[PDB]
Design a protein around this ligand. Structure first.
Ligand code: NA
Length: 615
């Protein structure tokens, strides 16, 4: 590893301060309003206006969004067109391909998500997930991924990250995060631990619109920072930092450049936090990178040019999205940002050696993940061919399937309700919040029929988001022979009275709690098989203590425009019809609604769908 250290330095010493500064910038070109074009457009394809700016400011990286990677053919092209534009050093192309409810690739393999991998628990599954996203990203020409999220969803009453997080436990989070990370690296992909110093239990400041952490240092070091520490020791490449007001480690305030008020310093802009805590006390010598510096709150309260400078002064190595430049009319923004830096350095506000370090860390990362020198040598056409047989491939899809199905978590199964074994002719009533969800379940039961794994049955759908359970809906439940219902909640806000959920109170506003619970009473009333499939946060499982079949899948996206947007719903359905073997155990604690203060389903709990005994 001492072979990168010198290599990197030999290189930095030969760069103009301007090539060094540009190399610490990583803007986004999500939307671009061309010359003499009516408005801004999703940038699907390169052009001389954007590429000029790359040649000119010589950025160190470009971050990509859903707009930029709509299709596999378009993506592999846009990447190679970027690499052409980049004058001297291979760009570091990055993206938020976490898996689960946060994916970006258009034709790529969306996985069950972190909280799913938590339920699955096996650390090999995590490593496979990263290894595949890695293969996929690598095949497109993307080399950096802002995953793993190692935030900890430890507070039901405040699930800021929820299913994007492995677990409510620090050890399960750090471990799974540890292996997702290593998975990605094995594919030669820069991996960035996400949301330092721990976004999972952030309060908010309604005044400024920033996340605030009010916890003291003992707590912070026990919980929030633990996952990051362990991954940092294990050789994390990058650490992404959120704009979180962080008073236990820095309670420096500034004057808002918009309010005049005394605003706490965001973690990102604090030398005590960036350099003091992360760089020194924690030992992180990788690349530090920040949330979008052009986020409104930040831009408005600290100023754009000023904020990027504060961040670099504070220790970050890569200022992400330093300004919002959509046209060539706005191109002088990048000039100013670099100019602020050039000046703050000339002044000795930022030692030249500090810049040389940062850049030497980027150049070291680029060398370490084979971005530098550029390791490929295939026609863009050939890259595209190779990519189409890799991104979204049947092999990957199978693994996605096995993983989603392994993660399904059975919480109740009284008297073998599951699996459903329908007679020919049986009517299955499918009930979810949105059409794309009832569609996914339907499409899945449909394949099972075409594949002769179940007798032919008849399906109707009921979509209840914002609805109230009225007579119409109840007649439709009598008609049914089998009922599959999806619950969807973030925070669990059942109307309740001394532990007794109140069912006599239904209004449109309470739909995510009152409605599915009304289906359930309706189905019990007429002696129907009813399983409940929770689609997001497992907390809603406390709403269905009377039910006899209950499962969690940790992923709510459905079926649309001919494509499955997530594996979770299908996997649930397969386990309901005895097709898959659900292994899942709770990666979080489900609080009881009927006996407040107690846990209803503890961490690690999960049933063997066949034997009925705790997995
Ligand atoms: Na490429």
């Amino acid at each position: 590893a001492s072979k990168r250290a010198i290599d990197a330095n030999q290189i930095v010493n030969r760069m103009s301060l301007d090539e060094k500064l540009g190399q610490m910038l990583m803007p986004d070109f999500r939307n671009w309003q061309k010359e003499g074009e009516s408005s801004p457009q999703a940038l699907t394809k390169m052009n001389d206006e954007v590429a000029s700016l790359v040649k000119k400011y010589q950025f160190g990286g470009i971050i990509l969004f859903a707009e930029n990677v709509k299709t596999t053919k378009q993506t592999v092209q846009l990447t190679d067109d970027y690499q052409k534009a980049s004058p001297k050093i291979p760009l570091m192309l990055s993206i938020d391909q976490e898996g689960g409810i946060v994916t970006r690739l258009g034709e790529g393999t969306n996985f069950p998500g972190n909280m799913a991998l938590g339920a699955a628990r096996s650390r090999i599954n995590a490593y496979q997930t990263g290894s595949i996203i890695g293969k996929e990203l690598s095949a497109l020409g993307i080399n950096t991924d802002f995953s793993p999220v190692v935030d900890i969803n430890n507070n039901p009453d405040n699930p800021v990250i929820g299913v994007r997080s492995f677990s409510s436990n620090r050890e399960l989070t750090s471990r799974l995060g540890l292996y997702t990370m290593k998975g990605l690296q094995r594919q030669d992909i820069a991996s960035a631990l996400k949301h330092f110093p721990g976004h999972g239990d952030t309060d908010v400041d309604s005044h400024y619109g920033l996340p605030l952490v009010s916890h003291g240092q003992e707590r912070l070091r026990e919980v929030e920072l633990y996952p990051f520490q362990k991954a940092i020791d294990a050789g994390a490449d990058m650490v992404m930092t959120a704009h979180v007001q962080f008073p236990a480690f820095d309670d420096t305030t500034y004057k808002s450049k918009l309010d005049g008020s005394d605003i706490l310093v965001p973690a990102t802009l604090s030398k005590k936090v960036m350099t003091g805590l992360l760089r020194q006390e924690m030992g992180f010598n990788g690349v530090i990178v920040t949330n979008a510096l052009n986020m409104k709150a930040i831009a408005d309260h600290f100023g754009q040019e000023e904020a990027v400078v504060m961040a670099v002064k504070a220790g970050v190595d890569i200022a992400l999205m330093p300004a919002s430049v959509t046209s060539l009319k706005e191109e002088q923004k990048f000039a100013r940002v670099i100019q602020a830096l050039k000046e703050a350095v000339k002044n000795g506000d930022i030692p030249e050696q500090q810049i040389n370090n940062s850049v030497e860390r980027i150049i070291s990362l680029k060398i370490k993940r084979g971005m530098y020198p550029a390791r490929n040598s295939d026609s863009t056409k050939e890259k595209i061919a190779k990519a189409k047989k890799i991104v979204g491939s049947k092999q990957h899809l199978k693994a996605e399937k096995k993983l989603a199905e392994k993660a399904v978590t059975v919480l109740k199964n009284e008297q073998h309700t599951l699996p459903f074994k329908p007679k020919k002719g049986s009517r299955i009533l499918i009930v979810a919040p949105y059409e794309e969800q009832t569609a996914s379940i339907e499409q899945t039961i449909h394949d099972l029929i075409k594949r002769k794994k179940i007798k032919p049955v008849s399906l109707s759908k009921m979509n209840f988001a914002s609805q109230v359970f009225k007579t119409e809906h109840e007649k439709q439940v009598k008609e049914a022979d089998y009922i599959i219902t999806g619950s969807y909640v973030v925070k669990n806000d059942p109307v309740v009275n001394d532990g007794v959920i109140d069912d006599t109170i239904s209004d449109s506003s309470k739909w995510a709690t009152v409605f599915p619970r009304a289906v359930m009473k309706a189905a019990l009333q007429h002696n129907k098989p009813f399983v409940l499939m929770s689609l997001r946060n497992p907390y809603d499982a406390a709403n269905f203590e009377e039910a006899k079949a209950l499962i969690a899948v940790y992923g709510f996206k459905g079926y649309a425009n001919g494509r499955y947007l997530q594996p979770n719903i299908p996997a649930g359905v397969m386990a309901i019809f005895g097709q898959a073997k659900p292994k899942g155990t709770l990666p979080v604690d489900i609080p009881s609604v009927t006996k407040p203060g107690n846990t209803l389903y503890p961490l690690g709990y999960g049933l063997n769908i066949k034997t009925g005994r705790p997995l």
